[PDB]
Amino acid sequence: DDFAKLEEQFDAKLGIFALDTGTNRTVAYRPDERFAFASTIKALTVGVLLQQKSIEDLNQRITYTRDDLVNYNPITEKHVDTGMTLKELADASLRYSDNAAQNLILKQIGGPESLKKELRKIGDEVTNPERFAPELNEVNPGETQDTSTARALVTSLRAFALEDKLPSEKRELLIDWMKRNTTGDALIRAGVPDGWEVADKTGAASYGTRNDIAIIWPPKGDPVVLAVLSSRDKKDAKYDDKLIAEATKVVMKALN
């Protein structure tokens, strides 16, 4: 009802899945409903890159041209003459949601098709990577390309960051980057109590899609993995971040 209330208030569709790793307690609402993943895919992409290379390989300097720049290149646009290391690219991608950075990384792993194979490998038969950025943001209802589910996103995020798809030191790199994200202050971070550390990755796409996936650490205890996906019934519809913050509060209460 609390979740229904939010859909009413914001005129949006909500997709939620939360798992308490400490008790295996779960919170779900439209858990298996498909939504464009948007930029949330950036986190899964780095997970794959990390698996593919050694910490040292990350120091490889990548040279690019103005031709590699897309619509949003906050960091990337400033280093076209010098090039950027894989490590630096991953930083740009996760912390600033740099689009060119995402594309550069994707190219390094073999493209969307390669990424897909790797996700399948980890046991994720839901996530559907197919395009580069920003076109991946263009999804119409019914379409399945560049989509996923709340349950699938948390399952996959958890695999790479908390489980055995990556060794400890690589897991650490990923978590640090995510913890220091600069784009999610008004989302999941806003619906969490004072003192709890958050690692998150946001996304925004067509049909007023607004997403946030994270891992939350209580003062003392095992982390909580959560996905909050949302969409609206109009192509040019805008989104309201308050939806995410409020939905988060409901989850905490439901788990607390």
Side-chain angles (χ1 to χ4, degrees):
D1 154 285
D2 265 303
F3 286 127
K5 230 178 291 101
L6 293 184
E7 289 177 314
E8 215 186 347
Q9 286 174 16
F10 294 87
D11 181 52
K13 194 181 82 216
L14 212 43
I16 299 210
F17 190 76
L19 162 76
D20 183 355
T21 67
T23 60
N24 282 155
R25 219 146 269 138
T26 255
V27 185
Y29 192 83
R30 310 199 191 281
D32 301 304
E33 191 66 22
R34 276 186 187 273
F35 294 80
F37 47 58
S39 275
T40 65
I41 198 62
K42 292 180 158 109
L44 291 191
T45 302
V46 167
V48 161
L49 166 82
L50 280 176
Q51 206 180 221
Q52 278 192 184
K53 324 225 145 188
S54 64
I55 294 179
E56 317 80 76
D57 296 314
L58 292 194
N59 290 330
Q60 131 150 244
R61 169 158 314 257
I62 309 275
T63 44
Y64 54 98
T65 81
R66 294 197 34 83
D67 294 349
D68 296 298
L69 268 35
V70 287
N71 74 314
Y72 189 61
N73 337 285
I75 317 295
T76 253
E77 79 186 327
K78 315 199 148 308
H79 301 106
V80 22
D81 353 88
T82 73
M84 283 178 76
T85 82
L86 286 184
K87 185 186 217 204
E88 294 172 332
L89 287 172
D91 183 277
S93 181
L94 292 175
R95 306 206 309 111
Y96 293 92
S97 206
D98 197 299
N99 277 349
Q102 162 64 10
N103 290 349
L104 250 26
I105 289 173
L106 206 53
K107 302 204 112 335
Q108 283 300 300
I109 59 177
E113 215 230 81
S114 166
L115 172 69
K116 195 197 292 198
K117 179 220 229 112
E118 294 309 324
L119 286 180
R120 295 294 178 267
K121 245 207 226 156
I122 62 130
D124 176 4
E125 250 106 19
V126 177
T127 312
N128 233 245
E130 264 169 58
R131 298 167 293 169
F132 282 92
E135 49 259 48
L136 73 80
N137 292 136
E138 257 19 272
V139 178
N140 313 294
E143 308 182 346
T144 67
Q145 104 267 52
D146 298 306
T147 70
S148 187
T149 72
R151 189 199 309 277
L153 284 175
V154 349
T155 301
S156 287
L157 210 219
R158 180 195 190 199
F160 281 118
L162 302 183
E163 305 180 306
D164 295 300
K165 307 296 171 198
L166 284 176
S168 48
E169 39 203 66
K170 294 183 193 181
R171 264 189 250 125
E172 277 173 8
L173 268 173
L174 177 69
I175 288 168
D176 176 65
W177 277 325
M178 284 179 74
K179 274 167 166 187
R180 297 177 297 113
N181 177 35
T182 77
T183 78
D185 279 18
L187 296 86
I188 289 190
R189 272 162 215 257
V192 138
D194 230 273
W196 312 34
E197 236 164 336
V198 177
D200 95 290
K201 184 67 201 80
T202 62
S206 65
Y207 283 80
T209 295
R210 189 57 157 156
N211 310 329
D212 207 19
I213 64 179
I215 301 129
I216 313 150
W217 288 271
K220 51 109 169 150
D222 306 89
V224 160
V225 187
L226 174 74
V228 180
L229 321 185
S230 78
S231 69
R232 310 188 75 188
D233 74 357
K234 265 95 94 172
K235 200 194 211 74
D236 291 351
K238 352 72 235 134
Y239 56 84
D240 188 350
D241 291 339
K242 282 282 329 213
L243 172 62
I244 320 298
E246 282 311 301
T248 302
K249 288 177 181 162
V250 174
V251 169
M252 311 297 291
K253 107 162 169 236
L255 283 173
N256 234 145

